[PDB]
Ligand SMILES: CC1(C)CC(=O)C2=C(C1)OC1=C(C(=O)CC(C)(C)C1)C2c1ccc(-c2cccc(Cl)c2)o1
């Protein structure tokens with residue numbers, strides 16, 4: 001209107017330009033897929049990042065099949081996870097990495113606590129969290145070769161007496177997968193995509209892409225009102 | 228549709 | 237060996253605290269009339285954030301304000317005309333705090349990047365560029381406030397606070413003693429002391445000049461998320477996850493009044509005072525803000541209108557109220 | 570009797586369609602801002618359905634009085650509204666089907682296609698495409714008086730040397746571009762969407778999610794069946810009378826007007842199928 | 856060991872402090888609120904003439 005002075009109109013024009021830039025940036029940002037990379041450092045997590053690519057948060061951007069993934073690693077935090085875990089509420093997916101070879105390894109602390117049990121309790125606390133009720137989790141069971149070479153020497157029953165199967169690799173791996181998946185209290189809205197690592201080009205990335213595609217399909221279904 | 232076509236009646 | 241000595245010191249401290257409690261604030265305040273029902277509306281609705289708001293801060297001129305969002309935006313709003321003066325992009329979208337300099341020249345931000353970024357607004361080039369970065373904390377940056385144009389005090393999730401020197405880039409003072417992640421920070425009106433609330437359910441009063449803790453306040457049963465100084469500089473209010481606010485006094489060295497309600501079970505994210513200190517505003521997780529009577533502990537008013545959790549709450553210097561919520565909207569009452 | 574029940578059916582369809590379309594338009598205008606593509610599509614569909622339903626009382630009056638008592642300009646604008654909004658409603662249905670197919674079967678491209686700006690562009694293109702038939706109905710539509718019967722009839726006027734050929738060609742073109750293409754597109758898109766959803770790990774994971782998939786399939790089948798049942802009879806009747814054989818009976822006239830009533834019932838029921846069944850719309854209303 | 860000694864020293868420093876009665880603190884807190892009660896736009900609604908956030 002004519003009420004605004006010469007500088008007021010310039011200020012309004014600047015605000016409109018800023019708003020246009022903001023909406024363009026938001027359109028670009030909402031077109032990208034967020035992956036919260038959790039797990040343990042001893043489990044082997046940097047190797048997965050190196051495979052996929054080819055001081056508190058490490059952000060990795062990579063493009064696969066015309067889809068932009070931003071993976072956020074929060075393994076450098078040494079504080080309470082509760083106070084900042086809600087920042088990733090709208091994350092597209094979680095990637096949880098655990099090492100199968102660490103079934104009998106003890107923690108670095110003086111307490112006799114199994115590393116596999118600590119990984120299981122971390123997965124239980126993350127999956128059964130009020131912020132990730134409908135967030136899909138991709139489970140990466142790493143170091144399958146080392147686990148296969150180690151299972152022939154040490155039985156799996158040392159971890160827990162519940163296991164009664166043979167000491168073969170396939171049965172033990174399936175039992176570990178089912179034990180991890182049984183921690184998912186909310187089996188209705190959340191799906192866990194378990195996948196043993198392949199250590200081969202375009203294998204883990206393809207699995208993550210498939211899970212992300214399923215999540216995007218569900219999001220589009222909700223957006224259309226069909227779901 | 229069809230209510231505005233040349234009908235015989 | 238010396239643990240018994242520490243226990244005896246704690247017993248002496250609590251006995252001295254009990255001795256000084258010769259009366260009750262509620263008993264003394266019975267002679268003042270109630271504030272009444274506070275009714276106010278969202279006279280301004282700032283829109284333009286496409287993610288959850290985590291922090292906002294008013295400027296010293298009571299007109300401009302700064303807001304930080306999870307999409308990596310520091311937006312400077314002119315509250316009178318709803319215009320956007322600046323929209324600073326952030327190198328890290330995970331921002332949990334923001335600050336406005338008392339001179340109106342600089343804006344601070346920080347978060348999970350463990351870095352306090354200082355941006356200059358009065359550059360000759362005409363665009364807001366990064367002026368300084370303070371990467372000295374090993375935990376996430378939870379709060380930051382400007383003492384001056386060259387000094388800024390920050391609190392981190394590594395149970396420490398730090399007074400920095402902006403022109404140099406290195407911290408000049410380190411405040412340690414908390415056993416939990418420091419979540420809230422508040423400067424005194426005279427900028428000589430400050431108070432910090434952490435996850436250990438205790439608030440510590442620190443001296444800027446000396447650099448060591450002077451008083452410690454307990455009483456909360458959960459983590460302290462918010463803190464704010466009383467306008468006179470002698471008391472301060474703390475909000476916790478126990479759905480309770482508490483008013484502590486520095487001189488009395490004990491809690492004075494607890495603000496809570498039976499049906500309130502959600503934690504407090506932000507606390508603030510009015511210009512006169514009569515109203516204590518607090519943002520809650522139940523999508524609403526509560527305006528308590530700071531002397532009668534009565535729920536004087538309710539501010540509703542946010543569809544998500546109210547995260548940040550600020551009161552302008554002249555007393556003429558901004559609320560930022562996870563619904564990507566700012567509301568000025 | 571029949572006339573009475575026929576006009577009662579016409580009035581019921583008119584009232585239901587008008588009320589539903591007005592309610593949907595009012596909800597979209599104020600309660601739920603048009604920020605998504607689906608909301609824009611629903612708004613355009615509701616507007617087209619309401620404007621088509623506005624035509625119904627004139628056709629009921631023509632059926633009862635057996636003549637057109639209104640002016641030539643009113644007849645022209647009514648015919649143009651009918652044709653234009655029928656085409657707009659059908660094309661909006663087709664584009665909603667294509668949009669949902671793209672969202673499901675092409676999730677990566679859906680990020681670059683389901684922008685509200687692109688939805689507005691698609692709607693503008695749809696309305697401009699229907700503008701051809703609208704302008705044709707404005708230019709050629711009119712009212713003429715027949716003397717040997719002393720009856721004033723409102724319809725599309727063509728040159729009398731080849732009026733029959735032009736009318737048959739126009740009927741064939743409308744039938745093709747309003748039934749054959751949209752029905753095939755809807756069938757293909759929804760079948761591909763359902764086939765893709767059968768392979769989605771989320772939907773088959775649990776019994777409740779299988780129930781949700783069954784509900785989605787039921788909704789899609791209901792939409793397709795409603796469209797087919799409402800639009801096939803009138804088009805088949807018109808084609809049969811245009812090329813098969815020519816006859817005039819009271820029962821034939823009553824069935825013809827009932828087929829027209831079903832064609833309008835399609836637009837009457839569209840708000841129920843597309844607005845009052847979307848989960849986002851239900852949440853916004855509550 | 857050293858942490859316990861540091862805690863003991865901090866408790867000794869905190870214990871050797873001057874404290875006042877809670878009655879005086881409450882009286883000063885009420886006095887400040889009553890002195891500035893007229894300068895708080897939130898406590899008393901400001902007429903739209905002086906309110907910069909006009910409709
Ligand atoms: C002319 C043309 C190029 C072709 C055409 O037939 C239509 C066009 C423009 O615009 C639209 C049409 C509508 O049916 C509705 C609307 C307005 C949203 C878009 C059609 C139309 C024709 C005549 C009226 C009308 C005349 C008077 C009053 C009211 Cl409400 C409508 O509308």
Ligand SMILES: CC(C)CCC[C@@H](C)[C@H]1CC[C@H]2[C@@H]3CC=C4C[C@@H](O)CC[C@]4(C)[C@H]3CC[C@]12C
Pocket residue numbers: 756760764793794797
């Ligand atoms: C509703 C009326 C008008 C039309 C009927 C449409 C439905 C029921 C029909 C039309 C085409 C059909 C599909 C044609 C081909 C195949 C491939 C076959 O390997 C599985 C079944 C499937 C996927 C059919 C499922 C049923 C189907 C979708």
Ligand SMILES: CC(C)CCC[C@@H](C)[C@H]1CC[C@H]2[C@@H]3CC=C4C[C@@H](O)CC[C@]4(C)[C@H]3CC[C@]12C
Pocket residue numbers: 797798801802803805806809821824
């Ligand atoms: C579910 C869908 C496919 C149903 C389709 C029904 C169609 C085929 C039916 C419904 C009404 C029918 C018409 C009703 C009345 C007459 C008049 C009669 O003298 C010749 C046949 C004719 C013209 C019929 C042709 C077939 C018709 C159009």
